[PDB]
Amino acid sequence: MTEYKLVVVGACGVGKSALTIQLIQNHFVDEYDPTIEDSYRKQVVIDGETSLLDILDTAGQEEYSAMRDQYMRTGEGFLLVFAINNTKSFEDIHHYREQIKRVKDSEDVPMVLVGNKSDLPSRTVDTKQAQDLARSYGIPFIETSAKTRQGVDDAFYTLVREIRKHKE
Ligand SMILES: *CCC(=O)N1CC2(CC(n3nc(-c4ccc5c(cnn5C)c4)c(-c4c(Cl)c(C)cc5[nH]ncc45)c3C)C2)C1
Ligand SMILES: Nc1nc2c(ncn2[C@@H]2O[C@H](COP(=O)(O)OP(=O)(O)O)[C@@H](O)[C@H]2O)c(=O)[nH]1
Ligand SMILES: [Mg+2]
Ligand SMILES: [Mg+2]
Numbered sequence: 001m002t003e004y005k006l007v008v009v010g011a012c013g014v015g016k017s018a019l020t021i022q023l024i025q026n027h028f029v030d031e032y033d034p035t036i037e038d039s040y041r042k043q044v045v046i047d048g049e050t051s052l053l054d055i056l057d058t059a060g061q062e063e064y065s066a067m068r069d070q071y072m073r074t075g076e077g078f079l080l081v082f083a084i085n086n087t088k089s090f091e092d093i094h095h096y097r098e099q100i101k102r103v104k105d106s107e108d109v110p111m112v113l114v115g116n117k118s119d120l121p122s123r124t125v126d127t128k129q130a131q132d133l134a135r136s137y138g139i140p141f142i143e144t145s146a147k148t149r150q151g152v153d154d155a156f157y158t159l160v161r162e163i164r165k166h167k168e
Contacts, residue, residue, distance in 0.1 A: 001043075004160065007058065008081060011088065013034075014117075022149055023153065037058055037059040039055065078112075080096050083116050084115050084116065112140050113134040119145035140161075142154050142158055
């Protein structure tokens with residue numbers, strides 16, 4: 001059984017922990033401690049093929065670390081998470097993709113743009129804007145809500161589809 005290292009990235013408060021805990025434990029966490037960075041395991045079946053996922057939920061300081069370059073380099077696929085009600089989190093997506101590409105020698109890294117908090121009626125990032133950003137990067141765009149669980153499996157499963165294609 002093939003095992004992949006997934007890394008969830010994005011600005012503080014976008015719902016990285018809430019998305020991950022929904023996928024793993026099937027419940028929505030409000031106010032999860034933003035200093036906790038931890039890895040989770042999950043066996044999934046996608047398109048009739050089993051994969052073991054090792055998901056790293058990034059947290060801690062928004063600072064550079066050679067140690068953090070080392071574990072990001074081991075990542076096979078990345079979720080680029082922003083919140084549809086926070087324009088700054090969306091503008092940050094460019095920096096996250098640039099950062100991942102740097103640590104991985106400019107490889108065409110499997111990534112999926114995730115537009116979280118889709119359950120909120122306080123949108124500031126247009127769907128067209130996020131689709132056009134994913135289009136120029138050549139990656140899928142998935143709209144999620146960690147609160148309602150809408151698109152949670154879609155986001156991680158689509159990243160696994162991208163990793164499978166890249167690995168071919
Ligand atoms: C509220 C807590 C939380 O959820 N956080 C998510 C983060 C921001 C994440 N993050 N920041 C960087 C980063 C920050 C500054 C910086 C670099 C490089 N140079 N500078 C000044 C990177 C990273 C980061 C990434 Cl994405 C990668 C691929 C490699 C790397 N090496 N060192 C840092 C990083 C991340 C994940 C953490 C706070
Ligand atoms: N309404 C709504 N709230 C979310 C969603 N995802 C996360 N949140 C909330 O946003 C805040 C930050 O979430 P968290 O998972 O800690 O973000 P992280 O800092 O990126 O790990 C918390 O109050 C969460 O309950 C979502 O899809 N919808
Ligand atoms: Mg967190
Ligand atoms: Mg420090």
